[PDB]
Design a protein around this ligand. Sequence first.
Ligand code: UGL
Ligand code: UGL
Ligand code: CL
Ligand code: CL
Ligand code: CL
Ligand code: CL
Lengths: 413, 413
Amino acid sequence: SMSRRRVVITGMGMLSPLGLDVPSSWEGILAGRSGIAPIEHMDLSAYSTRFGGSVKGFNVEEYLSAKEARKLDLFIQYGLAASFQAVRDSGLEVTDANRERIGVSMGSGIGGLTNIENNCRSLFEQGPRRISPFFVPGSIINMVSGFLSIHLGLQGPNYALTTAATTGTHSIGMAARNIAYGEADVMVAGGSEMAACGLGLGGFGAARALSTRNDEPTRASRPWDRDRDGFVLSDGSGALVLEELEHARARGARIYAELVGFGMSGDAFHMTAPPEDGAGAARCMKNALRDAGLDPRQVDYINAHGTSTPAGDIAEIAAVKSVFGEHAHALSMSSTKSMTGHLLGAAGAVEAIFSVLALRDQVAPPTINLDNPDEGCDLDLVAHEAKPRKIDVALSNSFGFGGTNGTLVFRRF
Amino acid sequence: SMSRRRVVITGMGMLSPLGLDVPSSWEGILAGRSGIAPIEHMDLSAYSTRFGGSVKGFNVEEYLSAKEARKLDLFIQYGLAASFQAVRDSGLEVTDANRERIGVSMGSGIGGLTNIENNCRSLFEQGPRRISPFFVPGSIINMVSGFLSIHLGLQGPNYALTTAATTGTHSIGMAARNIAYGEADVMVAGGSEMAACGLGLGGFGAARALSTRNDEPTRASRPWDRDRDGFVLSDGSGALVLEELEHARARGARIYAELVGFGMSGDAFHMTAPPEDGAGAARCMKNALRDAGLDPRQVDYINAHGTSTPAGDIAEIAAVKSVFGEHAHALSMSSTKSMTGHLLGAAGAVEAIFSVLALRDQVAPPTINLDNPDEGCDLDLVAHEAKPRKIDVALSNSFGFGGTNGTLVFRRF
Ligand SMILES: C[C@H](CCC(=O)O)NC(=O)c1cc[nH]n1
Ligand SMILES: C[C@H](CCC(=O)O)NC(=O)c1cc[nH]n1
Ligand SMILES: [Cl-]
Ligand SMILES: [Cl-]
Ligand SMILES: [Cl-]
Ligand SMILES: [Cl-]
């Protein structure tokens, strides 16, 4: 704990509704662009929600051969894309000397819902003889970590989290712990999701979790706005190359930031709804700050969970107020879900990247669509437009079904 | 690493094809009873495999009210059952003083395949308005950890692994790390699975992973036997209460054993097939022994992965030979999958329990059906009948799709 190794971010990668890499996504974020649109090439006329954030124009053949790619669900494709981008971005070379010290932890919330839909259809219409032989290996959540390790020869710790909307945040935090306690020197960590099929929209629609603002998809995700009506379902991926500091310094790696804190908590409250005061979120953020050895006054920017739900958004404000007190009125906090929608198991991965870039570029991304902040939402929520400011420390929150909570703390380096 | 806290097992719980708790399962194991039978209340006439290990006579109402239980997929039901059994067995009392120091890590390989099947059927026949509102929260893998935390008021680290057949082993190992590095004082860890639906049998059947010995289901699982033809799909759950040693001693807990070692590796080889020498398994077992600070000569019993696959079984023997050398001929190694079949994400959880009970009762469980050991399978594989012997250290292996590997080391206490 006092003798643990320090962990830095040397590589990043992303597919989002705003772009096919980190630079293009971030340009969208800093412009206040929505990635949400009507979902195409899919007949959603029966569904109460017919829009979301899709990854537009993705070519898996930049990362995999066609033959390899056809084995895999889109969530795996997306996770490999972000991973390969992050590894490349890191400049790391995998050798016989280091391959056992490099692991992977790429998770998903829902996994291969699209493959399950297609295979279920084949099963019901034709029978079990039309199930793909790649159905199981190409749809299971740990096959990002698995295929990444195969393709790059990674022999270190190899696993996958699934903690709903918290997955990406946990995947990064726990990979950092791996490095900090010397179980690995490098980890590829993050997550991916592709739930914009009928089971996903249908499932989340039946749970009454989604916005139904079909007439104005770009206005649907509106965190802390009084006309919010639930979250927007989005697809994509994020990956970070985490690396022990001295390992990174020794090879002259470009270091984007230091991952100084990781906190976890459980609400122990409700399956899908938070406690109204956000007490689990508060405990989680405290754990993270204490983990980082930071005073709350050192936090400059919070990338909120901020999913555009009635209860969730207000609970998150209550938690930030509780943890930060008067300093809650000094920091900036925004929800990039206003633009990206909710990427579920990838949300914390892409939001970790946006947090790192906020530190790099000294700029708080906007919460777009925040026209009439609800009762109690009186913080600097960066309404409408990106805000240049001093950011030495950034915090990223994720909260998921089951009351599972994760916070990461990043520090300028 | 040198200053980490020690971790002991103070509670255990299980549903398996051999019983509805730990004592009844273990009685079956020590008798050499098969849990495999034709799967009933399910029309499998179109499928190439029509048998498996089902949990027979389970009453979820012993653990949950009917109202709560109807929200949840069977895999969640099974995981809560084992968890509640383990917590009860531990004698731990959850209070305002300790609830933030008690977490949960219960995983699954496949998750709520049964719920997805049912909901997919409703979606296709009727439309998205017949999807259950509980479909998403009651089918996602992290809802064991989530519901357990809600029901028992656990506010500590709350997560879920999904690493195929390795899930249960990773869930225990990583929960132990939580305690060892002081992120929690107690963890409920393990896994659960219920894949014996059509998508599971169909999926694994299309992948050519399963035995098709429909005429003699009890003979199908035959690890290291020359007539093996793939694994047997089984359902169930296992949970351990892990606890910091001084915490357990201070409350006078009954301690079953000490969890001394956890190792991970990745093969970085093939999606579904191992390297023929089992080199990943070897690295993993070495990592675990080094983690435990044990000489290979200290291992008395190995609970093998031993799934009854052509390549897998031989690769595991090669790995044990490589790691243990001449001591490979001194230990006993058995596969309890001979009796239980392959519980997928729960396999390592139930096999951790069988390893702990081997230490408690000084007895190596049998590998039943091992009539003609294949070329190279010349170890003490405990063919046919349980073998009383000295066991101070037991090792449990799990290997999963993606080449992800896990080993746990338990020591008498
Ligand atoms: C239970 C919800 C999960 C959010 C999601 O599905 O992404 N949690 C919150 O909304 C929340 C707010 C503050 N703390 N938890
Ligand atoms: C790739 C397989 C996974 C086994 C399973 O699906 O449960 N791995 C082995 O069989 C194996 C044997 C030795 N090392 N890995
Ligand atoms: Cl298909
Ligand atoms: Cl619009
Ligand atoms: Cl239904
Ligand atoms: Cl039989």
